[PDB]
Amino acid sequence: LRANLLVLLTVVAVVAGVALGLGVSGAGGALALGPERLSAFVFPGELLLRLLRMIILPLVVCSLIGGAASLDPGALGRLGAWALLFFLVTTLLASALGVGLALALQPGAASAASKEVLDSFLDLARNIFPSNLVSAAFRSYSTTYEERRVKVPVGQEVEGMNILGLVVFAIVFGVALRKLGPEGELLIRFFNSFNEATMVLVSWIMWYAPVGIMFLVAGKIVEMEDVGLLFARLGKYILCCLLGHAIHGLLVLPLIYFLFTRKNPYRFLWGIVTPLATAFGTSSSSATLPLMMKCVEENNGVAKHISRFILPIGATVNMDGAALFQCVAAVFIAQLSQQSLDFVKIITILVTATASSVGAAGIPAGGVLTLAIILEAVNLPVDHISLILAVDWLVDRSCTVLNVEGDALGAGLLQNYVD
Template sequence: MEKKSEINGHALPSSASTDRILEKSAQSSCRQKLVEFLRKNLLVIMTVSGVLVGVGLGMMVRNMNLTKAQMTYFAFPGEMLLRMLKMIILPLVVCSLVSGAASLDTRSLGKLGGIAVAYFLVTTLIASGIGVALAFIIKPGVGAGALNSNNLGLESMSSNKETADSFLDLARRQQGKVDSEKMLRPSTGGLEIRLKTKTDLEYYNTRVLQHFIKVDFTLRNLFPSNLVAAAFRSYATDYKMVAIGNDTNGTTLYQKVPVGTEPDGMNILGLVLFAMVFGVALRKLGEEGEELIRFFNAFNEATMVLVSWIMWYIPFGIMFLVGSKIVEMEDVVLLVTSLGKYIFASILGHIIHGGIVLPLIYFGFTRKNPFSFLSGLITPFTTAFATCSSSATLPSMIKCVEENNGVDKRISRFILPIGATVNMDGAAIFQCIAAVFIAQLNNAELNAGQIFTILVTATASSVGAAGIPAGGIITIAIILEAIGLPTNDLSLMLAVDWIVDRTTTVVNVEGDALGAGILHHINQQEMKKQQEQQQQEEEELAEIRVEAVANVQAEEETSPLVTHQTKTLGATPEAIESVL
């Protein structure tokens, strides 16, 4: 007979029954936790799975020997993802900056902006230092003198660009396709690239120029002459030869004259500056500007809703983005063996900066675990790895930073668009390594002045590097021109840019995210200080009021000219006097 115990007259089940109940409750609890975990991290799991499935799919389709047209169709879903992400960049950047600048106090805006600029400059300078140091330690160009850009179908590459103009223009421009078998004429963008065969021409069209970006750094683009045109055009300086007369022998003399051009490509820096200034102006208007501020806030929130919808397409698009890149690969073994040390140095620099330096900076400011902060950003990191575009990663980065890490919207929507434009730590690393690599390739000894020039130029030029695939390649030409090295070996960088650019973009967006976290922490500390100061002032004011009441009561007792009536039920004058 089963034994039962009684408490207050109620029968209880046996210990075996209790164990079964507890076991069932534990199983249901574990099941609920698993379901909750999957529900919260479903998008992250799907995104990472998309990358893995994309690798397997690419390796499988690679053996099918697809034609160029079939490769284009295969990459179509990934192209659609890029187009959707780029579509959302313009409204997201403008509206978020206007609402962010308008919601912050002018003093807070200036202070946070100063801290952000200092953070961007210091981290980029550290990244440049890491790149130069690794290049001299690993020496990727030593022993690679036999490596020739002819192996890649590109003989030479020269820039029709003056270094001074590169720092006066802040433009981005994308080259059109090669329309001649001989060369890409300077009038199409200032580059002269000789191609040997029609096969090389086809290779260049399909593999290089699709993602080849001409980057010009210009202050002129900070102030676009046409704000509407800045949404799809930028400004860049080009050169043309103008006849100025004849010499004594009758030979025509020509002079190289700079001319302004308007290549296709969003002038993101001009839009960023205008949005910030416009937001500050709206706040200065006070009540008159509230309606317009609410409009931009609503526009911004609607844009974020669109972002949340697009993010569910990211796993599917990333699968085909990664798969198409694997299908397009030609002789990967040759590239890795010939440029393996350069690839290794670049990726190692990104690991050191992104895995050690940036987390240490975050920990130094916040005293919090940086990796728990970064664990909430797996989706934007995966997007950055697949798209190679910090601008395309911006929508998912803003959403994850706010929802997963609790960063204030005013901070994230103010600093992340700026960081995606000007903060390029990963680009600074590979640019410095590439510059030293080309110097070693040409057996050129770099002195201390040239090394310092590389550091400063890479830090400054990374500010204008385009947040799009291959955005930093031509930036290296500026560094090479500054230290007096030839630019004809830059085509080697193009051959492996699709490998290095992935870790470069991840480090770029990581620096932006940690910067937003640091600014959020500093803002929280300032708010706490203000609240404590306000509370202390209120306490002091309360003490002054109590003393004033006591003095009034004393005057009432001693002065016959002052009469005071206190309505207190059931209280004697002695009791009132003792309370005061």
């Protein structure tokens, strides 16, 4: 049966990728391979990432326009308000859990070894309302400084898709098309057709997902080295992050889903195994978004409009795992510096992590850079980020899995709420 066949292929691909990476590293690794052969070996994962990122723009734009244009403005507003409330509550719970685990386990007991806040939030506001749509299709506004010796911000458009601005524009355009009446109907049809066509492409790219995922992990454990030393250095911190992610994903979110929707939450999770493993392989929520929409619509009973309206918004707003990681890292650095944490400091770490989780730049370091602003919100040293960079390759993937899982569970919860 194909639904189980794809899951079996994905699991086999992940296991074989880990085994192949360990074998290649044990046979000589990158030194035996060389940089040319290393890039050639990694290439299929890069190809999968390119295929996933190619169809992000038409999928998101058409899906959001169709979803907004298919609901009454009051109903759409209420649905969006409920979705935002769910996202905020889940992010707060994730941050609180991360802080609690970091304080309980004390990963900083071993002691064996940028952009401003206001500019970051102004950049977020600028990215919400893009200056140019075609430019927003592949560029985002970022603030840089010039020493005019007082530094002043300048800002320019740097590479990287502006998903948030496209999402906002698509929602507003769908609302306008709904308001038009008959005149807009044709356009709605057009966009709907376009979206369906993109879905067909996904149904093919999905079948290449396992073969890529294997390589996408194998090279990732071949490029790295000194696994034992890094684990001996940061075992407590890695355990804190991974345990927080596991508790939030396997206990808290399914508990909320069961409380609000009496159905089995793990049966729901079984239907999105492939997008979750794709998120782990790629470490990007936007790239695994199309597969998650496909699985949520097909494997689960979520309605088309609800899924295509909630999942694109959550893919940019809901970042539970990132908030958990940032809170854990901030607390860990606080214990490293022998500096006690105040209750006000806990409140502000929670609030800052939740606020800065929204609208991630999307680059692999985007979370890490975020922590810097966080560590500039409350006075803590920012050099220690170096050791955090030693293992970010795995923590980021663990974060991405949780980011997309929260989206899927929220879509299911809202679908039940409408029912």
